[PDB]
Swiss-Prot record:
Keywords: Hydrolase, Secreted, Serine esterase
Pfam annotation, one family: COesterase
GO molecular-function term, one example from the UniProt record: carboxylesterase activity
Temperature dependence: Optimum temperature is 60 degrees Celsius with cyclic PET trimers as substrate.
Keyword 4Fe-4S carried by entry: no
Keyword Hydrolase: yes
Protein name according to UniProt: Carboxylesterase
InterPro entries: AB_hydrolase_fold, CarbesteraseB, Carboxylesterase_B_AS, Type-B_Carboxylest/Lipase
């Protein structure tokens, strides 16, 4: 059972059970406590002897998901301060040059962890892939911009963990030259951010963007506003020097309140006109700080960032229904609301018709959901694929179309449902995908992910702007499709950002 591997910071003890060596809670950065909430991740103190790497470590401080989301997306909080840790699954640490997959969890930069059961790496290890997951700093601590703190610590954490992988994964049987980094949404947007970040150079050879693209950044001045509001509500200065002492429950509380206010209609008196106008999608997304992130990841990618990196990208067909549907309130959304929403992107009311004509929404709420799926995920994802037309690296796309049965099927192929199929952790995600999700689909998606990590090819035709081909994952039939939803797609050609 017990298996001991040398890391850069000293020896770790995992456990091999059934030809899988599992290491949990390998620290890649010192506990980011107090002032170190907001410092660059520090190499862990290089211990002598054997540190236990058998239990998942603490996870980053996060608020609960909203009641709606949270019933579907059941997080596993692990208390503690020492959460800048990573987990490795390998079939054999003595293996030569196994594909390494580094998982960057999503959760809108405020939630999630590497260690959520659904992100279990065993299924990747069983297929000859070294799997790495890890926690990175979230929310205020991870990403709120402060004048006296390096920006985007959660991003610096991701780099640190990817650098850990670079420096250590060979001792867990992995090829540091064959690292596929992958993430869901905020994790995928992170990947996009990393492609745009000098400090991530060469840290991954391939990327799987699962329902996340290069549009999730906060302008510096909006991050400054967010930090200021956070601070005013904490009765302290908008500085790391101040926030280093706020009890995390009060950080999270104010953080949570910022998240909801930005998710809703932000008061312009509180937030300024930009943020009230919607300049901020996610308020704790990486800040365009100028150094780590000189520009929005989409523009960097449009200019060739990550073009040397093989890309498997995709979205869930009904992604945003996760956020609009599970409270039973989709039917109350109105056409004029969709029209006003369309108008924010300079689209006329009748753009909604294209959604209806393409099976993407009978009622306004259905359309809004699809519109938002397009605006924040599918079109940004496609803009990345389009930017890579001349990239030396390969681009493959997918659409996760399997509709979850939960809540009478109201969710469709909503956000996150592809996670347990990717990880073959379907029995850990029944709150989201129900009790009897098709395991064949899990095998299919997972093997494609394994194939992509292994060779840069998921096993289906490459995505190009000619045919815009993607693997439409569903059950019983996952089959290639071409240029899915072209009319709604063509709606966004001139839409800013
Ligand atoms: O809709 C989103 O942002 C637009 C704001 O209006 C959104 C972004 C990221 C995530 C995420 O990281 O989900 C992964 C959960 O495992 C979820 C939702």
């Amino acid at each position: 059972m017990e298996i001991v591997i040398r890391t850069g910071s000293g020896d770790v003890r995992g456990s091999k059970e059934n030809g899988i060596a599992v290491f949990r809670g390998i620290p890649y950065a010192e506990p980011p406590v107090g002032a170190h909430r907001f410092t660059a991740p520090r190499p862990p103190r290089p211990w002598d002897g054997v540190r236990d790497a058998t239990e998942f470590s603490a996870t980053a401080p996060r608020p609960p998901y909203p009641e709606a989301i949270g019933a579907l997306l059941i997080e596993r909080f692990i208390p503690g301060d020492d959460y800048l840790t990573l987990n490795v699954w390998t079939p054999d640490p003595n293996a030569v040059g196994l594909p390494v997959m580094v998982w960057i969890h999503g959760g809108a930069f405020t939630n999630g962890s590497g260690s959520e059961p659904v992100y279990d790496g065993a299924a990747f290890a069983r297929d000859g892939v070294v799997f790495v997951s890890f926690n990175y700093r979230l929310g205020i601590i991870g990403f709120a911009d402060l004048p006296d703190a390096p920006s985007n610590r959660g991003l610096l954490d991701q780099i640190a963990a990817l650098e850990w992988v670079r420096d250590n994964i060979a001792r867990f049987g992995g090829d540091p030259g064959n690292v596929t980094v992958f993430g869901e949404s905020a994790g995928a947007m992170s990947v996009c951010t990393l492609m745009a970040t000098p400090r991530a150079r060469g840290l991954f050879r391939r990327a799987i963007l699962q329902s996340g693209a290069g549009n999730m950044a906060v302008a510096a001045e909006d991050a400054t506003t967010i930090a200021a509001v956070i601070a005013h509500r904490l009765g302290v200065e908008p500085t790391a020097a101040a926030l280093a002492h706020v009890p995390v429950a009060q950080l999270l509380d104010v953080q949570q309140q910022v998240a909801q206010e930005i998710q809703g209609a932000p008061d312009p008196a509180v937030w300024g006109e930009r943020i009230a106008g919607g300049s901020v999608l996610l308020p704790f997304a990486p800040v365009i700080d100028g150094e780590l992130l000189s520009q929005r990841p989409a523009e960097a990618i449009a200019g060739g960032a990550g073009h040397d990196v093989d890309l498997l990208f995709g979205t869930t067909t009904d992604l945003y229904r996760l956020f609009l549907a599970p409270t039973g309130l989709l039917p109350f959304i109105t056409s004029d609301y969709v029209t006003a929403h369309l108008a924010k992107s300079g689209l006329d009311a009748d753009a909604a018709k294209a959604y209806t004509a393409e099976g993407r929404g009978e009622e306004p709420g259905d359309i809004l959901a699809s519109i938002i799926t397009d605006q924040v995920f599918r079109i940004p994802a496609l803009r990345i694929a389009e930017s890579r037309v001349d990239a030396p690296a390969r681009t493959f796309g997918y659409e996760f179309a399997w509709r979850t049965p939960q809540l009478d099927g109201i969710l469709g192929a909503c956000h996150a449902v592809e996670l347990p199929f990717v990880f073959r952790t379907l029995d850990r995600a029944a709150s989201l995908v129900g009790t009897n999700p098709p395991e064949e689909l899990a095998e299919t998606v997972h093997n494609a992910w394994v194939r992509f990590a292994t060779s840069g090819d998921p096993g289906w035709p490459a995505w190009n702007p000619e045919t815009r081909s993607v693997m439409r994952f569903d059950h019983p039939v996952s089959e290639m499709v071409t240029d899915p939803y072209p009319a709604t797609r063509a709606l966004w050609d001139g839409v800013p950002l």
